[PDB]
Amino acid sequence: WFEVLPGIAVMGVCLFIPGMATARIHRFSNGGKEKRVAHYPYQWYLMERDRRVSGVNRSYVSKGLENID
Amino acid sequence: LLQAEKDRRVLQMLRENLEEEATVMKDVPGWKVGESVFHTTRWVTPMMGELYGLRASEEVLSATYGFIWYT
Amino acid sequence: NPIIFIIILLTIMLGTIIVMISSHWLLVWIGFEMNMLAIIPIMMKNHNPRATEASTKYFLTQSTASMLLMMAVIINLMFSGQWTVMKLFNPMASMLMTMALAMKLGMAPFHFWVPEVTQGIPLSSGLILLTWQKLAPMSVLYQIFPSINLNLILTLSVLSILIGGWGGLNQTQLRKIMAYSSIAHMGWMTAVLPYNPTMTLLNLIIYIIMTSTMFTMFMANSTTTTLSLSHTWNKTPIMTVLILATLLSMGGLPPLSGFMPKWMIIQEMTKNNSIILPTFMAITALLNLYFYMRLTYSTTLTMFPSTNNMKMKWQFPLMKKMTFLPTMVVLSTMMLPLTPMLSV
Amino acid sequence: MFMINILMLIIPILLAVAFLTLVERKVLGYMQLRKGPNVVGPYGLLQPIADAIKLFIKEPLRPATSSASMFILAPIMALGLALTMWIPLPMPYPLINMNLGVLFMLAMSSLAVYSILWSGWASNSKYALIGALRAVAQTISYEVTLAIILLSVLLMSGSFTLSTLITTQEQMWLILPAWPLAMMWFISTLAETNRAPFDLTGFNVEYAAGPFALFFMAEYANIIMMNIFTAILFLGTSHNPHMPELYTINFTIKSLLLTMSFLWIRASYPRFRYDQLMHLLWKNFLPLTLALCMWHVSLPILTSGIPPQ
Amino acid sequence: MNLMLALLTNFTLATLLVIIAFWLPQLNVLPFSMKFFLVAITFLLFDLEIALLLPLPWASQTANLNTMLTMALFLIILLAVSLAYEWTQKGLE
Amino acid sequence: SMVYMNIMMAFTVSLVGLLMYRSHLMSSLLCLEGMMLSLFVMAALTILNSHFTLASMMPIILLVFAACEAALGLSLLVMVSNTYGTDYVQNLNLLQ
Amino acid sequence: MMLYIVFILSVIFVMGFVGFSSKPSPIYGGLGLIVSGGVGCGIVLNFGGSFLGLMVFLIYLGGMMVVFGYTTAMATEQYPEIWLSNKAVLGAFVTGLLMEFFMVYYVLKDKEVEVVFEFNGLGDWVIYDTGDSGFFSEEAMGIAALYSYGTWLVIVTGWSLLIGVVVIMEIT
Amino acid sequence: VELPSLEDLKVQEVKVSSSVLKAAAHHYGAQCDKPNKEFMLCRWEEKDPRRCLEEGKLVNQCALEFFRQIKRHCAEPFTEYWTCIDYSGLQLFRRCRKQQAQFDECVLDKL
Amino acid sequence: PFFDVQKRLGVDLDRWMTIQSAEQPHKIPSRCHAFEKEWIECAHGIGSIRAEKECKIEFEDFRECLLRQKTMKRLHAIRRQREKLIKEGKYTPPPH
Amino acid sequence: VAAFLKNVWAKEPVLVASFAIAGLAVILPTLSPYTKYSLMINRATPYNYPVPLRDDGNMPDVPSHPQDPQGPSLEWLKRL
Ligand SMILES: CCCCCCCCCCCCCCCCCC(=O)OC[C@H](COP(=O)(O)OCCN)OC(=O)CCCCCCCCCCCCCCCCC
């Protein structure tokens, strides 16, 4: 009954990687931010706009209130 | 607000696609600049070829294919 | 079986209603699509492999006769996009319109579409159902009418009676003799249609009645020509005069009423100074009677009724609405002061 | 670095089932009063790494009675779509944010029947010619029993996409309104993926050591996938934005228990004797499926509880 | 733009492995049955009328509902009446 | 545009000599359903960009009858092969 | 990944039809359709419409093709062959295959070739022509299939499907 | 046809990010109400937005002072409010429900 | 022929899925929506036999709305107005 | 016919339960008043923009102020 417990802790740990990996990529690719999702064409229009006015070329950075004062 | 922030853009966008079109060639078999293809002098909505000319390097793909085939 | 034999028979006319009652190109797509799906089991019932080797030749013809129509339908979607049943706004589409539609009303092209189907079917009971497929696409042509290339429609009609006048000189199968001359009247009512589409249906109504009486008189015993020798002195001598009352009328002689549309077909066709074309058709219609003479010479002259087997028993067929049918098919030529007023 | 997300999902999922044939037997072992792999491991854990070496040493002799262009074509698609179906699946973040993906899983799984028709047909006679047909003929009957009751929960969850499916199950464990559907979900998914009660499943016996391993490796790939697909649908987990790690901790560990169920049901039951096997679908399953299909329409209407989208 | 660069790695990985499997590390130098046909035709009939059944969750965020209620139930009826006449004859199936 | 010119040649896979001929008669009925999807897509080009929003049912209801017509003629070729075993369209007995 | 990625699939979609246009010993004809219609499914997935093309996988490519592939085994029980391995197959495969690139060869590669064969320029973004942006309602194309006003279609088309079963509930 | 010049362009566009633009998003239009509905009649009732170019700047001008107003008086609970909703994913309005009161305690009070 | 049952008894079979601008379930128009509303207004009481000789104008710009035919002809020759003088200067305009 | 429900429910207890779900599903949407609350919500979901109109004399109702009690009351749901 004991020996099956190392059997569980191999294949089950082998699924822990990609959920950890992907959540440490898109978080890493946007600098500690989640990825902006786009499901409707009105939602994409913000990212199509805001990338052109972010600072140079990025959608994961913001301007804030202090931009135009 | 953003409606007023979009129509302002295309009046700018059509101008530099027209002002840089008037200065191309003043040919005797050339176009009268400012003509219309239609007869009815009204405001038709412009076409994707009229916003962006034959430039077509990245940014034109960045406009039409923006929502399409991913976020 | 006998419950759904009505239900299959019910949905055929349900198809051609939707063909008539619509303002929409996709419903008239569906219309004689489900008709072509409703005709197949009527061909089958006794499950003989000749009937299967006749319906499948009937099948993939009318499949294309469906599927070519939609290729015309998407063109005037790309050309002005309106879906009212009207002019097609493209001669490349109206060409694709008619000469696809002419398959189901089979013209002088698409030759063996009619006889190879109708011969080889054991169900000679009816097989009057191939009057419905003569009825439905005529109810589209009344609305396609004022956009046709005007030369294609008359070319198929002059050729129509030319082959149909020639086909039954080489025949004994009275099904094929009745498969032919179904090309004949379908050349005339196309040849009117550029000039007054009303009174086209006058040719259509007379053709229905004189074909309805023909197979009901053929549902006594006869399927072969020499089998029409052995009924005058065997089955009933009263049928021998009545079959001569119709074969001579459908040839078109003026004292009977079979001549009546061809009387009126010229009063419309001339007064628009087309003279050489009705003369070529009427002189071709002379040959339409030499099918019937050389056939009526067999049944009404007692040509050797051999094979001694006497029918002392009575007859119980279903002669449904039969005896009232050759009363407007003979003596109605005085009785039409205005058939072009109630129909038109 | 989008490419390194790809290789850190395809490669770490192969070891997820290459180390499962071990677990297949040990769970089978400790029911029968017997131990696992004893001499090689020591705890077993050194067994499949050596056995993976053998099937590429041992000579793959080819049939002279078959074509070659068709015979290796079915293992091409076997790793193709049965691994492609992993892609728009969240944990809690999917690789692709598809706007509709529940149709996309069924669109790929419908081509699973299109692989078995290859290998039996292009190879040989009888067994590989008639015996490989029936297995398509059972697995064509389990899409209508699959897709209809699938549609009956989208009526209440709200839409087609999978990202909204987590938020709508944050208080529920949605087996509770669909415990009749929970049987006919799990029974039907068991039957499609060719396992022990629903088995008749010559489409393997001709494969030597080379390409048998693929259609043993792809078939196992399906079975944890129907576990992970039932996992996000029925037994939804909690979500934390500030702590994404805590999602995946209690995510795969729930799918790993249902992974044992295919190993656990296999140790109980006999077969179903093919004539009954389709007879228990049309006569028995399917009329209840239409009834509950009518059930999940009227009740969100007669609640004024339509899910928003 | 990686969809389309997303599966291209997956399919080049499968066709790679067969070359190390079937190729270079090897180097060796129907009767007809009617009852097994009619179920495929029967399946495709119920395969069509679930695709017309398919657009339901978008058909709820809509206008006046009793049009969409009473008509969507009618397709299930035609899917069920089709069973019953066919239930009169299934064969050894 | 060129996207309309191709696909328009793709409609001319309904070549009639390769639509009822030659034998292996399943290859004939092959391009019949192959003539479908040359009309499903070609319609769905113009319906989609010119935002009609109402004729979206039209290509969907097209494919409903497209398989349903294709369902019928496949059944009859079994009835051909029921008494024969092979299709072989050069089979001909019933003449005109 | 270039600008011409939509058009270049369409030319590939043309050649999938030519693969079964002669006589591909009809088991490869199924493999002529799956390669075609999937690429044909790729063409529909542009231009806004996502949902309406993906069903063609299920209803036709998973639906019709399997039952299509379920035949040619219950019938045609002779010995098949790989196509192009004969001289009856390759006798016309190249003929229209030359014109498929020859149609592209001068539609726009010359300056003006000529009047009615140079009307449609290749590219560049006018193939889409979909600006400006839209709404947050749907695709749309998303609110596309409605059990509003079209109901006369559904009562007819469903009832046509019912009597299709009965005709196949009989003879076979 | 004709188009107006490069003049009556280059006016002060509100160069803010999309999250901080959707941050307030609710108190913004709910109190201005004079140029916007007039601009809607200028666009919906009468088409051709070339006779209609002037009031697109007027409603733009009102937003200029609007963010200048919130910056001068109460912005510290505002800057933390679009901080949490910047932590992305679908921009739900229930994750930042807690911090909403610290912003909204003074919008009815300070100004 | 066209019996028109739906005219007397006042229900529509469809009559809605007919033109480009009839229903639009959430008031979302089409691209050439503005020319349907004009071209119908031209010939309504016209009996269609003089309509091909009287209106003749609002059909044209409508038909060319659907294709943008000469617009594509006018735009393509700009690639021959410029872009044969590529090495002959005329960048026009400089970025941005 | 009273034992007819008790000589088939002890004989084939599968489709018997189906017809009971065929029942109790058609009848009840025409019964409880929770419906037509389904209609009031599904119409009061704003997709598009409510465009204002032009005044000329009247003014029957609804001046320019949005926060005035000038329109309907769908705010029962927030209180619900
Ligand atoms: C009025 C209020 C509204 C309505 C509410 C009513 C609620 C009703 C809920 C019903 C839904 C579940 C029932 C679904 C049908 C189950 C299938 C079935 O019962 O078939 C019975 C099967 C066939 O044989 P049978 O008809 O019984 O004939 C022999 C008679 N001695 O005979 C059998 O018994 C064999 C059982 C099937 C064989 C497969 C068993 C394999 C083991 C599977 C284990 C499943 C574990 C649980 C599922 C996993 C959880 C996700």
Q: What's the CATH code of the domain at F28?
A: 1.10.287.3510
Q: Count of domains in chain F?
A: 1
Q: What's the structural domain count of chain A?
A: 1
Residue F57 counted as domain residue: yes
Nearest-angstrom CA–CA distance, D8 and A15: 11
**Domain annotation for chain E: domains and CATH numbers:** 7-88 (1.20.58.1610)
Which of E43, E47, E89 has the CB atom closest to G59's CB atom?
E47
Q: How many distinct structural domains can be found in chain G?
A: 1
Structural tokens at position E71: 């008509």
Cβ neighbors of D210 (< 8 A, separation 6 or more) are D55, D56, D60, E18, E21, E22, E26
Would you say D87 and D107 are in contact if contact means Cβ atoms under 8 Å apart?
A: no
Residue D54 is inside which H or E element, if any?
Answer: helix D47-54
**C-alpha R_g of chain J:** 25
Residue D187 structure tokens = 């029974």
Is cis: bond before G124, omega within 30 of 0?
A: yes
d(CA C40, CA C58): 9
Residue type, D270: P
Atom of ligand 1 nearest to the CA of J20: 1
Q: Which domain holds residue F71?
A: 2-84
Contact J42, D307 (CB under 8 A): no
Of chain A residues 1-60, which have a CB less than 8 A from chain G? 40-45, 48
Phi-psi category of C314—alpha, beta or left, where left has phi over 0 and alpha has psi -120 to 50? beta
Alpha-carbon torsion C152, C154, C159, C160, what sign? positive
* F24 located within any domain: yes
Instruction: Report the CATH number that the domain containing residue G143 is assigned in CATH.
Output: 1.20.120.1200
Mutate one of E35, E42, E44 to test the F interface: name it (highest F CB count within 10 A).
E44
From I43's Cα to the closest Cα of chain C, the distance in A is 14
Helix (H, G, I), strand (E, B) or coil at I16: coil
Q: Cβ(G142)–Cβ(D159) under 8 Å?
A: no
Answer yes or no: do I20 and F52 touch at CB < 8 A.
yes
Q: Within a domain: residue F91?
A: no
Distance CA H102, CA H108 (A): 11
The domain of A35 spans 1-69
| CA neighbor of C330 nearest in space, from C261, C264, C263, C259 | C259
Question: Ligand 1 pocket test: which of D258, D268, D280 has the largest number of ligand atoms within 8 Å of its C-beta?
Answer: D280
Is any Cβ of chain G less than 8 angstroms from the Cβ of E74? yes
In this structure, is residue F92 part of a structural domain?
no
Which residues face C224 on adjacent strands? Answer: C173
**Which residue is it, tokens 């049955």?**
E33
Quote the tokens at residue D236.
């939804």
Method: cryo-EM
Task: Tell me which residue has tokens 């728009």.
Answer: D88
- The Cα–Cα gap between C236 and C244 comes to 14
CA-nearest residue to H35 within chain J is: J64
- CA C177, C179, C182 angle in degrees (round to 5)? 110
The single-letter code of the amino acid at C169 is L
**F88: alpha, beta or left? (left if phi > 0; alpha if psi -120 to 50):** left
Residue F64 contacts E, CB cutoff 8 Å: yes
Give dist(CA F15, CA E77) in Å, integer. Answer: 41
The rounded distance, in Å, linking the Cα atoms of G101 and G103 is: 5
Residues with a CB atom less than 6 Å from ligand 1 = D 180, 182-183, 186-187, 197, 280, 284, 288; J 17, 20-21
Name the helix (H) or strand (E) containing G37: helix G30-44
3-state SS, one letter per residue, for F49-84? HCCCCCCCHHHHHHHHHHHHHHHHHHHHHHHHHHHH
Residue spans of alpha helices (H) in C102-184: 115-118, 132-135, 138-144, 152-164, 174-179
Amino acid identity, position D238: S
Q: Do B11 and H13 touch (CB under 8 A)?
A: no
- Residue J16 CA to ligand 1 centre (angstroms): 14
Give which of D96, D180, D117, D105 is closest to D143, Cα–Cα. Answer: D105
**Is residue F95 assigned to a domain?**
no
One DSSP character per residue, chain J reads --STTTSSTTT-TTHHHHHHHHTTTSSGGGT-TTTTHHHHHHHS---S-------BSB-SS--S-TTSS-S---THHHH-
Q: Domain containing G127: what range?
A: 4-169
